[PDB]
Amino acid sequence: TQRIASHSHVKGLGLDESGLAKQAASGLVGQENAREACGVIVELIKSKKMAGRAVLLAGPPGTGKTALALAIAQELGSKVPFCPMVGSEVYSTEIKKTEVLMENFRRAIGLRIKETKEVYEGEVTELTPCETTISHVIIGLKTAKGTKQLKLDPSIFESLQKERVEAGDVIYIEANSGAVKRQGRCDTYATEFDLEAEEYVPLPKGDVHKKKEIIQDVTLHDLDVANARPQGGQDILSMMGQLMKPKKTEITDKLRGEINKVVNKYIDQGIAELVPGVLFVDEVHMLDIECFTYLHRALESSIAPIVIFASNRGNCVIRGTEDITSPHGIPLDLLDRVMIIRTMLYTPQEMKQIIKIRAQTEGINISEEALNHLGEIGTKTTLRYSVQLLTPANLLAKINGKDSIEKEHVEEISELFYDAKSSAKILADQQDKYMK
Amino acid sequence: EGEVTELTPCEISHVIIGLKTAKGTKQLKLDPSIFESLQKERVEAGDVIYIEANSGAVKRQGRCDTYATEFDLEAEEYVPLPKGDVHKKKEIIQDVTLHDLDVANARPQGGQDILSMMG
Amino acid sequence: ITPGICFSTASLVLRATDVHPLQRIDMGRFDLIGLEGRVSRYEADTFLP
Amino acid sequence: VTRIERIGAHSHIRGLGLDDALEPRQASQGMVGQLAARRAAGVVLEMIREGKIAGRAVLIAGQPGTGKTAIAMGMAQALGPDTPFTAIAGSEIFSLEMSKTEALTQAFRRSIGVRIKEETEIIEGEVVEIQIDRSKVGKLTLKTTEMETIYDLGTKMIESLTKDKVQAGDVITIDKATGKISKLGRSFTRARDYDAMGSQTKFVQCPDGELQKRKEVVHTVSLHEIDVINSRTQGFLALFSGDTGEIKSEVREQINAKVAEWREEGKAEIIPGVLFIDEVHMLDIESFSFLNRALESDMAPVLIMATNRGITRIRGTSYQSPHGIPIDLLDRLLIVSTTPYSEKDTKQILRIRCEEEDVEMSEDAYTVLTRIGLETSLRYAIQLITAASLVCRKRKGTEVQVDDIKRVYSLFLDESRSTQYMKEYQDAFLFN
Amino acid sequence: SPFYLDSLEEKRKRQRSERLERIFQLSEAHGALAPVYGTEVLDFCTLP
Amino acid sequence: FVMPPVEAPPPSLHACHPPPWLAPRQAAFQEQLASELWPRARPLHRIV
Numbered sequence A: 001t002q003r004i005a006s007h008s009h010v011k012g013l014g015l016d017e018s019g020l021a022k023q024a025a026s027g028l029v030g031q032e033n034a035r036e037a038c039g040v041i042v043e044l045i046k047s048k049k050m051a052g053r054a055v056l057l058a059g060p061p062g063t064g065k066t067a068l069a070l071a072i073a074q075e076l077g078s079k080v081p082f083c084p085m086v087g088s089e090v091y092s093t094e095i096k097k098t099e100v101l102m103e104n105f106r107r108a109i110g111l112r113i114k115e116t117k118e119v120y121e122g123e124v125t126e127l128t129p130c131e132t133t134i135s136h137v138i139i140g141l142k143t144a145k146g147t148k149q150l151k152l153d154p155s156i157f158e159s160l161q162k163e164r165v166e167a168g169d170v171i172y173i174e175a176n177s178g179a180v181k182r183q184g185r186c187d188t189y190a191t192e193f194d195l196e197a198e199e200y201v202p203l204p205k206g207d208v209h210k211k212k213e214i215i216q217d218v219t220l221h222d223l224d225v226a227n228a229r230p231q232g233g234q235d236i237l238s239m240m241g242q243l244m245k246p247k248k249t250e251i252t253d254k255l256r257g258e259i260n261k262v263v264n265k266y267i268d269q270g271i272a273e274l275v276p277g278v279l280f281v282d283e284v285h286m287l288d289i290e291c292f293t294y295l296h297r298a299l300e301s302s303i304a305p306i307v308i309f310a311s312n313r314g315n316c317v318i319r320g321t322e323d324i325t326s327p328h329g330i331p332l333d334l335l336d337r338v339m340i341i342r343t344m345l346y347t348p349q350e351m352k353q354i355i356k357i358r359a360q361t362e363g364i365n366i367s368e369e370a371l372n373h374l375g376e377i378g379t380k381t382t383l384r385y386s387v388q389l390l391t392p393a394n395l396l397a398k399i400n401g402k403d404s405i406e407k408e409h410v411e412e413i414s415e416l417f418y419d420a421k422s423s424a425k426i427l428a429d430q431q432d433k434y435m436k
Numbered sequence B: 001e002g003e004v005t006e007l008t009p010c011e012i013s014h015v016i017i018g019l020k021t022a023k024g025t026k027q028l029k030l031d032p033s034i035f036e037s038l039q040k041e042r043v044e045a046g047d048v049i050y051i052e053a054n055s056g057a058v059k060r061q062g063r064c065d066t067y068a069t070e071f072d073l074e075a076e077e078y079v080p081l082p083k084g085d086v087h088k089k090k091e092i093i094q095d096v097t098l099h100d101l102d103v104a105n106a107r108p109q110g111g112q113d114i115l116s117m118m119g
Numbered sequence C: 001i002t003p004g005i006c007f008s009t010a011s012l013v014l015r016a017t018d019v020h021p022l023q024r025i026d027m028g029r030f031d032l033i034g035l036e037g038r039v040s041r042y043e044a045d046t047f048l049p
Numbered sequence D: 001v002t003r004i005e006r007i008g009a010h011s012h013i014r015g016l017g018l019d020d021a022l023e024p025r026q027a028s029q030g031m032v033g034q035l036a037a038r039r040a041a042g043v044v045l046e047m048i049r050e051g052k053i054a055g056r057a058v059l060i061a062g063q064p065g066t067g068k069t070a071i072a073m074g075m076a077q078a079l080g081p082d083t084p085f086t087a088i089a090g091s092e093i094f095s096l097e098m099s100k101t102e103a104l105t106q107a108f109r110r111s112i113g114v115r116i117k118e119e120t121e122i123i124e125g126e127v128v129e130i131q132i133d134r135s136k137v138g139k140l141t142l143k144t145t146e147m148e149t150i151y152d153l154g155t156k157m158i159e160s161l162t163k164d165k166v167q168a169g170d171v172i173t174i175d176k177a178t179g180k181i182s183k184l185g186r187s188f189t190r191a192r193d194y195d196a197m198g199s200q201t202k203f204v205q206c207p208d209g210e211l212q213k214r215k216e217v218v219h220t221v222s223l224h225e226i227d228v229i230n231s232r233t234q235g236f237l238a239l240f241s242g243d244t245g246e247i248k249s250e251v252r253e254q255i256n257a258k259v260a261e262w263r264e265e266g267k268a269e270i271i272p273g274v275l276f277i278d279e280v281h282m283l284d285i286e287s288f289s290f291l292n293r294a295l296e297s298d299m300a301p302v303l304i305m306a307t308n309r310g311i312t313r314i315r316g317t318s319y320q321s322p323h324g325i326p327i328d329l330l331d332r333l334l335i336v337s338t339t340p341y342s343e344k345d346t347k348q349i350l351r352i353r354c355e356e357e358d359v360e361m362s363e364d365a366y367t368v369l370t371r372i373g374l375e376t377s378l379r380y381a382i383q384l385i386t387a388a389s390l391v392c393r394k395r396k397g398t399e400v401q402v403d404d405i406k407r408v409y410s411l412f413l414d415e416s417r418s419t420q421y422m423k424e425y426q427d428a429f430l431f432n
Numbered sequence E: 001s002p003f004y005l006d007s008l009e010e011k012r013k014r015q016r017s018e019r020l021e022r023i024f025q026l027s028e029a030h031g032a033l034a035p036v037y038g039t040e041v042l043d044f045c046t047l048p
Numbered sequence F: 001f002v003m004p005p006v007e008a009p010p011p012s013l014h015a016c017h018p019p020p021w022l023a024p025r026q027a028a029f030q031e032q033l034a035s036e037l038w039p040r041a042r043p044l045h046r047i048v
């Protein structure tokens, strides 16, 4: 990521070999108990034997719940599916909320498939169907390393004729599927006409027969959506269906179970590996009572992933209810099913450390007095406001001709921009003038 | 605009058409879409037709009046021979709105292809 | 009658979803909906085993 | 290896743990306590298995953590996979595609299984020669490892063979009644050593035995599946997409009549099942009103429901009812009450969970965890089982001790402690 | 056989073995899946 | 009698170096759809 995001400095949980949390490591400062709990949760995710366990990160805003979740994702690695979703993303206009939740659940479950692919690629030097109907197709493919003669299954002749493959074209043929793609004409024939509307492609460099053993990760949702609608099809209904607008559909549980059976078959064969993964739901308080009730059942499934929730609400009304209040905006029945990780507020020293880390991540040099002033500002207003003042202050320093942030630049930026509390005070002082 | 004297397909098959009016005769080569439209209009030798080159809209107006005496019950509507030239250019003022252009470009129906009908 | 809108884009954009065959697995091993109307229970249960 | 089915919240439950007299054992098949509730569940299970009585409703009511979903999973496990068991949550009937009543009708019809049995004569062999004179008349030669014969073809047979592109070396089966041709595979010869193969070609051995064969297919489908098949031209696609919509009632009446005709003819058998709706209190008053009369049909399954609500507000109304369910529906159903577990029952459940997760715990650890479970909740203790196992494995231990349980108790908070800590810093949180 | 080469024939027989192995693996792969419903069930359940 | 005030062909996508397989595939799809569906659209000729 070339651009710097809000959590670009989080590289991990910062734990040691014993699971204890270092004071400042991997871009995380403080929150030692929460980081140790997240390390235990990571160990839970790595030990794939548990399904449907749910975790809630509860604390005041700005205490690092999203940072902790992203640190968990980094600790697991790109091999484990980490699906981040926002609670307000379940209000789709195409499918019901429970369908969105189950789709994300299946997104979190990953499948790793090891397969060797074979492709015959090269310029076509000969294309001769052998009559007995067509018994087989003899094709001649040329590369920089030689020429190869291939006997093709007669079903591939239809694909070759559809793609308009002639001598001199550069094509590839999939050994397992027979798919043919004509990727242009060979550049040796580029001068056969002075003006043709053709795409001329260099002759392939390697061998005609190319073998590669690859490991590709797919999720259960990919297989669900792959089996929701048919693909290809020369029938009139299929062709007219290709023009239909692609709409998300409520995939049946029958299809889910059949796909689970297929996945188990391939796991038993030994060509597939299961990666349970993690589903992160942020702003879970935006879910209504129906979503929470469905989560009660979904988490109890033996196929579900590990779900991590985050909430900053206090005793607030559940979204779908009239006046029912709950500790985090989450019904007590779902709170009974989750392990709660509590995040605490930061001391001024921790805030200064986080500001310094953000400055280093953004490529900004800041003096000690400027850092102390920024920490004082963060204590006065908010850590996020102080972190957001670094880049504009650096820009003012660069305009003034200085390569480092001085106290005067921080003061100028604090004068130019206001925080939430200052703006609210201004609004309260001028209630009549502002719109109601 | 004129009476059709020759409708010869030219192999997707193009059409070579011969039109006569009270002022002259002209032979034209038209796109296969226009030939399909002519077939849909059931245009045969002796029929008075109107073709708009901008939209490719072919309208068969009737069997020419000169053939209205051949039969007593033909189940045809006869139309006089056009009295101008075979090829005409008319300049007119069109009143449109921006919304009309937006609609025409958002739900297109000017291609006269199968995809437009499907959409 | 107006000419159509000619929308010009980068040639690289049309290849965004394209993945080389040597870089992707065969998704036909999970094709359940493709078997309907083409494969029978006899073939799956009695003949092929 | 790690299969798709892993240790869940009810993976330790294999049945209801009853004897031949439906007397519940204290700890059998993974269930502890709930003797009266388990006996009631067994009675309901016998009622389901008999299949004589239609549209019977049972509500499993009780406090959270008292084993309602445990009992439902035990009933599902004890009932064979042959008998349908549709388990849905209350929130799943609110769909953007079909009405709530349509969702409930589809849930009802998914719970009745129809086992079909079709016997069909087929011709099965490898194609040797196809000669067609001129698309008018022709001959087809088919062979097995022990047989070979030639057939005279008509116009439609020739057209069907040309449409499917059947050639020499293909192993095909032909239905005598309908004439449809499906290709099983092609035989392998020395000249068929392809370097690339199509996505549908596969090589099979030449069939043995006799060219004429009888094909018997037995499958279990639900009424909803037949409805979706006969809803539209390619309705079987909606069995994958789910874009069924609202099926017409006339289609459903026709399919009920046709299924009765099949059952009379001996070509199909009815297997009524169970519809389990978990957290029914999420249903609206309209849904309850529909349920009132949906259970009165002769094709209605057993409706098992589970709620943990006290006297609360019915959704969509301002009225208070004992379970969130209007008393008219509650009069149509039998209520099975679950009692809270004792210390011994909690300890036995913890032992079963530890055995399921393969965790060794000391007896002092079991005592501490049982005390925690009584104080906080049973599910909290169950989660602490795995948390403490992980922490113990981290310190290179083999048996979970009291120190590990205390450590995970300090690391992970239950609802009460989290609520207290939030109340301590209430102004920090948003929208109190 | 004066022009016979051992290396060329070894390469050719290795290629033949690889081709046969590929044929086997593809034939196994293309018939592993069983239909959820199947043609017979759908035909039986499909009213006029 | 109602005619749209404006009539336009569908927007066209142009790239300097497009995938040389997209256009032939679209052309074949359109040709097949037209050959299968145009005979069925003849009754609507007077309306069009």
Ligand SMILES: Nc1ncnc2c1ncn2[C@@H]1O[C@H](COP(=O)(O)OP(=O)(O)O)[C@@H](O)[C@H]1O
Residues within 6 Å of the ligand: A006, A007, A008, A010, A027, A028, A029, A030, A031, A059, A060, A061, A062, A063, A064, A065, A066, A067, A068, A312, A354, A384
């Ligand atoms: N303990 C911490 N160490 C380092 N950075 C932190 C810490 N806590 C919060 N941050 C940073 O502060 C910013 C806001 O925190 P955020 O994760 O949004 O908190 P919340 O999710 O509770 O709103 C994030 O960009 C995050 O990287």
Ligand SMILES: Nc1ncnc2c1ncn2[C@@H]1O[C@H](COP(=O)(O)OP(=O)(O)O)[C@@H](O)[C@H]1O
Residues within 6 Å of the ligand: D009, D010, D030, D031, D032, D033, D034, D063, D064, D065, D066, D067, D068, D069, D070, D071, D308, D349, D352, D378, D379
């Ligand atoms: N009688 C029992 N035997 C074994 N485990 C039980 C029993 N009752 C409850 N449990 C366990 O307690 C957990 C919560 O109970 P459950 O029945 O799923 O929800 P609730 O009873 O709150 O509706 C489940 O994981 C279940 O395994």
Ligand SMILES: [Mg+2]
Residues within 6 Å of the ligand: D068, D069, D070, D306
């Ligand atoms: Mg429950």
